Symmetry: D2
Subunit: 283 residues, 4 copies
């Protein structure tokens, strides 16, 4: 199917668009059809992408891949990441090895890694008040208020606890290395069928992250005794205002993201270089 | 099968043996055969237990249940816990509700909860240097040395990292609320098929716990450049000395522990009362 | 001798309003001059007592009683610290790090203090100054903390930290909490900071969920001057919040200078006050044996 | 003027032994009197230089140079602090919180110091005293930390904490780290403690993986006297370790009293020494922009 190739970038970088110019010329010389993102095309003179491309190449950091994954996941189109120079959890191809790597994938040497996303649904009673997907995390937080908020947590209909905190981070394995990690959560291997729940700046010192089955359904009830309207954020990009008493329901989407890596992809190598963990011992 | 009932206790408590005397009289008046633990029987005048009992009742804390689980797990005998007054993660029955609860189970109203254990195997080359089971955790630590130790971690044959630390905590979901929790690890729901790896007092500040698939095989290589012999501990009860260069291999045992709870058992209620988490909101 | 007594209360709670009525009757029955803060008086008309602003209450009162808990104590302290007027707190129900008087025990405990039986200690405050180049863009004091954060934005913010003009680091984080010993048990504690005993002359700097995992709180001498430079490459305006109650919008490139305020808050307690008991019961710590 | 130079080195590393040979030649070529510590001299015979004990090296030296990194600096500091003799550290390879001289740059950097160009600061130490009732059961100083731990036992230990005779709490934990500002970046940091700037007159108390999740580090004034009571209900003998290098066995019921030592360590650095640069490169913190 690899004939219609889409390219997405994050603007504002010399080095990005240089990688872009190198990629276009490499695929054109392979007699492939190349479709630029409407916004990236305005930076080099010369949402619907998943529907027409058989493969989408994302140039940028893990953040660029994040924005593109929700759109590409629902369209069942494979996604390949090129980083800005160092490995990212979602972007494995270095810019200077672009021709080797990308040509390797187009020729048929690549590994496929499903990643699951979350569905966030805000409700007032049974009325939907907003729905968003998230590859990394669904985050409940106070928005513009500088006060702590209050909420209850249910998992598969069972009451877990109430708490006072800034909010809550609910993360996939992909998101376990992003906000959740900074907030004290564990790393979860990308193949783990699990969801982590990480309290944000909790009042209660014995608050601790919980890891639950990936097929679990989460329900957050915003406290009806609050005076402020908190916010729910998906991948830090799609936002919804919640009223006191609203519910936020979170579970795993059926359609997972088809993420492509070169055959030499190594998840732990990525952890070592990004997080600085020790390499093999010497003498 | 509930005819041969075994009873294990932790000695040194008035309240323990009072619970014991109440339990014996309750089962005898049910015309059941009651077998006391050799050591508990010496405190009231008047290992092989899994082989003859159809049910074993453990009286004591979570720690008493821990010691009994490795023996009872391999014999496929169900285990029921009575706490010392407050819920434990493994002991759900309060002493004052003993007659109601225990009679409920013997009559047939009970829930069954498989818990998996870990197998720890120390090796020098291919030679076994010690094997132990663990319901909570396999812990690598410096023993009597007060210096940091050094080791490498492999998961399913793949190199993860080396590090300098006091050691490593490898925990089941059951053990996720014990040592691993104090060391900063996440809580893992008892039904989660996962293992958590928690570094102990790591030199590297970006060290963080990792959650891996429950069917993963872990291999720790003790650094060959060390001058001290670290220790491996299973459930803090079975200990093995490791030489520089020895390996510790850790995976999930096939035979899981058949843990019994009354029908009203609620895992999150236990988290709230033990950890002090907030209850349902009020007005 | 306490003759003129001010009352400050954080409006909202109904039980707070009743506690102020009991406190009013109690002080007037001791033949003392009660003075009500402007807003509080407007919430309960018919009082017939002298009123004044929060800002001036310290110029005319021997003692101020604060109703409404720790958060309400912060606003009181910011007004009264410059006046050297001692402050006494009454709980909303549960004990706090700044209030040790249950409304249950109002008459007994405030009576003891008025009868000359009390503990008095001082607590220092922070002084935060926002600058855009050499122009002043907002000043606020804080008893607990000065907090740089993204406001309504969900993005991480980038900043540099200087202490006495020496570059410490730059980082990407949710923000930065700068806390007094008083504030060390509040937002800073929830962000992973240490507890600082109130007698310690020190300031704690706590990165808020930093992207760099090796980032860690630093405790510095209390006479240190801190400088936070908001990265000129930010695309959002961060917020600086003093005690979570007074706020300033920062532009990219703005600096925030923080140092210890010369005038300290004078905090009165009943003689039974015990800081470690407060820690033990508010934080759950174990007791004897 | 530095005339008499002592050398202290932690034996074991081969590269350490070479660095001591280069340092020896360098000082003798400047016509200075070199003095070798008893054990070090026995590792390289034929030197023909005056030797002395570690304990007395401070009575006869103008300056002591320490080879072998931060851990080796701790033992040197414990011997020399009581003598007011300045100490200069040489790295084993990578820079440290106590040594800023690469063996690569030995002659240039030690030359600068000897030629009168240096930074000098003082660091305080802890004094730990074990008592069984009113009998003394062991005393040790520490530049980094005094650590109560279970020794070879795997069980949690139970203890009470007192500060200036006031009960703080009892708890169940792996143990307790008590650290100076110098030690705040060592074991205490790995246990979740904060960094304390070396200028801060403070001590940090860090529970080691406490069973109580609400347990948290506390920072107290540096002139505070700490008291740890080993629970009389322990069935194992815990250990008290000073700087991880000097050890005492405690019985159930024994107390450990910890306070600041009057005599401070005099620490010399090259003029290019920068504490925050040390933090940035040893901990990974971000730099300008
Ligand atoms: N304190 C925090 O750590 C914090 C606070 C708020 C939001 N966030 C994260 O930021 C995400 C939104 O990104 P954005 O729209 O704001 O654009 P962005 O600036 O490009 O992304 C923010 C940073 O997180 C990194 N990142 C993104 N996903 C990651 C993952 N799965 N694992 C590890 N690192 C990851 C990005 O990597 P690149 O530099 O390579 O692009 C970037 O450094 C959210 O999902 C949230 O998790 C983190
Ligand atoms: N996630 C967090 O931990 C978080 C987030 C935002 C703000 N805060 C804190 O809230 C402060 C403002 O107080 P607020 O009532 O107006 O806002 P708030 O967010 O509504 O409540 C702050 C809570 O912290 C308590 N508190 C206040 N000062 C404290 C102290 N020095 N030590 C321990 N606890 C303390 C308050 O106790 P009372 O109930 O007695 O008032 C209140 O329960 C800010 O200075 C900040 O430190 C904390
Ligand atoms: N710093 C720490 O937290 C630390 C240090 C060393 C060991 N440990 C734990 O102690 C275990 C060995 O127990 P032991 O032989 O020494 O006898 P023990 O004294 O009876 O057990 C030690 C304590 O841990 C509790 N515990 C045991 N298993 C638990 C679990 N799955 N979840 C939550 N709490 C649990 C026990 O509860 P009860 O009081 O109800 O008996 C007890 O408070 C080890 O597996 C290790 O995890 C913890
Ligand atoms: N899990 C841990 O973090 C842990 C466990 C036990 C002991 N320690 C520390 O080790 C100290 C004894 O030193 P050691 O070499 O004899 O034992 P060690 O366990 O073999 O090594 C301790 C490591 O910490 C470094 N270090 C020493 N003092 C430091 C400081 N003030 N700040 C930052 N790093 C420092 C040492 O650096 P060099 O390589 O330059 O010598 C060494 O890399 C003890 O005071 C204790 O604090 C830490």
């Amino acid at each position: 199917p690899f004939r219609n190739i889409g390219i997405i970038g994050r603007l504002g970088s010399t080095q990005v668009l240089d990688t872009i110019r190198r990629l276009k010329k490499f695929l054109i010389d392979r007699h492939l059809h190349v479709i630029l993102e409407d916004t990236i095309a305005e930076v080099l003179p010369g949402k619907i992408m998943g529907e027409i491309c058989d493969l989408v190449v994302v140039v940028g950091g893990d953040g660029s891949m994040l924005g593109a994954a929700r759109a590409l996941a629902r369209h069942k189109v494979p996604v390949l990441g090129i980083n800005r120079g160092s490995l990212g959890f979602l972007t494995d191809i270095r810019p200077d090895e672009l021709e080797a790597k990308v040509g390797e994938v187009l020729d048929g040497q690549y590994i496929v890694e499903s990643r699951f996303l979350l569905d966030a649904q805000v409700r007032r009673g049974i009325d939907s008040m907003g729905q968003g997907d998230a590859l990394n995390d669904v985050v409940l937080h106070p928005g513009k208020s500088t006060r702590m908020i209050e909420f209850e947590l249910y998992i598969d209909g069972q009451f877990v606890c109430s708490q006072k905190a800034d909010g809550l981070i609910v993360a996939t394995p992909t998101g376990s290395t992003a906000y959740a990690l900074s907030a004290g959560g564990p790393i979860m291997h990308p193949k783990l069928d699990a969801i982590v729940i990480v309290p944000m700046y909790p009042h209660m010192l014995s608050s601790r992250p919980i890891v639950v089955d990936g097929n679990s359904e989460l329900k957050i009830v915003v406290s009806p005794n609050m005076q402020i309207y908190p916010q729910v954020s998906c991948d830090g990009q799609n936002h919804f205002t919640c009223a006191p008493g609203d519910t936020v329901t979170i579970s795993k989407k059926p359609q997972k993201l088809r993420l492509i890596h070169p055959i030499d992809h190594n998840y732990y190598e990525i952890c070592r270089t990004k997080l600085g963990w020790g390499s093999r011992l010497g003498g």
